[PDB]
């Protein structure tokens, strides 16, 4: 009956440099129960190749997952993570900001 | 290595 909403961080593996290949990460954590829907977006559209870590959890029992994809950032392209969970009325979108 | 069954 008690549920916990996900914390969401969107960031890159290495410091962002335009035209240099990198990895776009969306880390979801602190949530319960485990079902969660995560999409990485490029200019508002769903990226297809997205991989994710194996489900695990923290000492307080809340779950965490990393969703990631290879990307080459540019000045114009906008990146984001869209998350849905039973605790959320509508999907939550977190935009990628190089300075976090 | 995992623990080598005890029901609730």
């Amino acid at each position: 009956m008690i549920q916990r909403t996900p914390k969401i961080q969107v960031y890159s593996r290495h410091p962002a440099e335009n035209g240099k290949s990198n990895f776009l990460n969306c880390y979801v954590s602190g949530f319960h129960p485990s079902d969660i829907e995560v999409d990485l977006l490029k200019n508002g559209e769903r990226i297809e190749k997205v991989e994710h870590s194996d489900l695990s959890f923290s000492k307080d029992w809340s779950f965490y997952l990393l969703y990631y994809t290879e990307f080459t950032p540019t000045e114009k392209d906008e990146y984001a993570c869209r998350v849905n969970h039973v605790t959320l009325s509508q999907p939550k979108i977190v935009k990628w900001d190089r300075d976090m | 290595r995992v623990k080598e069954q005890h029901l609730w």
Partner: protein, 276 residues
């Protein structure tokens, strides 16, 4: 110098969508090394770290056998918990288990763990003596009574002081190149004006392993705990972790603020300031 091995199991029921999913992961410190998922096309304990790949067929077959048996036990425990909590067969529920051992630099047992949860709430835990239980409620007291009758704690204690420590020592030696290497954080301070009156100073730590780190801001040498925004430590995806801490400062007062970094990879704690 100190190390840990931990296994994490999650069993999740899904009425009308088949049998409950069972997922197990194993870690040494902050490095995952094995996984099992009942939803895989061919469920098997599978390697997730390069240093475990050398383990022979006897290891992989034995670990897979234990995991399939544990999946069967936890699907039965989900049915038992419905009865103990007077719940219907319509909802989804979750059992979680975490167990393992911590050793010091000499490789001797520092402490053992065996804890369970139902629907994200503590259910029953093995106490630090490895001989008695702490039950969270009257349903877990039924399991405690059954486990005291079957001398379950003695069996766990034998595992935790025996095979757990012996195999953790083996993995540490086989993976010494990475498991026994601390990667210190790469640190820097960024400055972002908010308005004419204030700016954000953000202290970054990147590329560090293990995950444990302390990042703090001080103003005139006093901790700014209430005023600091600290993000949760996050995985980079290449084994290392990242973290930042930020403070909002008045324009022109930037030099009153210092960022302090503590990490096992650092011989001494680091002091950083914004460098315009």
């Amino acid at each position: 110098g100190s190390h840990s091995m931990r296994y994490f199991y999650t069993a999740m029921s899904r009425p009308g969508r088949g049998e409950p999913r069972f997922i197990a992961v194993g870690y040494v410190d902050d490095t995952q090394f094995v996984r099992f998922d009942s939803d895989a096309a061919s469920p098997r304990m599978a390697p997730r770290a390069p240093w475990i790949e050398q383990e022979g067929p006897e290891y992989w077959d034995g670990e897979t056998r234990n995991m399939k048996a544990s999946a069967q036990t936890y699907r039965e425990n989900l049915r038992i918990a419905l009865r103990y909590y007077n719940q219907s067969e319509a909802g989804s529920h979750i059992i979680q288990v975490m167990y393992g051992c911590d050793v010091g630099p000499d490789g001797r047992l520092l402490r053992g763990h065996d804890q369970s949860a139902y629907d994200g709430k503590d259910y029953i835990a093995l106490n630090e003596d490895l001989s008695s239980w702490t039950a969270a409620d009257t349903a877990a007291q039924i399991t405690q009574r059954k486990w005291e009758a079957a001398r379950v704690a003695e069996q766990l204690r034998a595992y935790l002081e025996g095979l757990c420590v012996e195999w953790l020592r083996r993995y540490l030696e086989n993976g010494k190149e990475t498991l026994q290497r601390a990667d210190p954080p790469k640190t820097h301070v960024t400055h972002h004006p908010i308005s004419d009156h204030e700016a954000t100073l953000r202290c970054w730590a990147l590329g560090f392993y293990p995950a444990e780190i302390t990042l703090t801001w001080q103003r005139d040498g006093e901790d700014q705990t209430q005023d600091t925004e600290l993000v949760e430590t996050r995985p980079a995806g290449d084994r290392t972790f990242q973290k930042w801490a930020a403070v909002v400062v008045p324009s022109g007062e930037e030099q009153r603020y210092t960022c302090h970094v503590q990490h096992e990879g650092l011989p001494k704690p680091l002091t950083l300031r914004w460098e315009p």
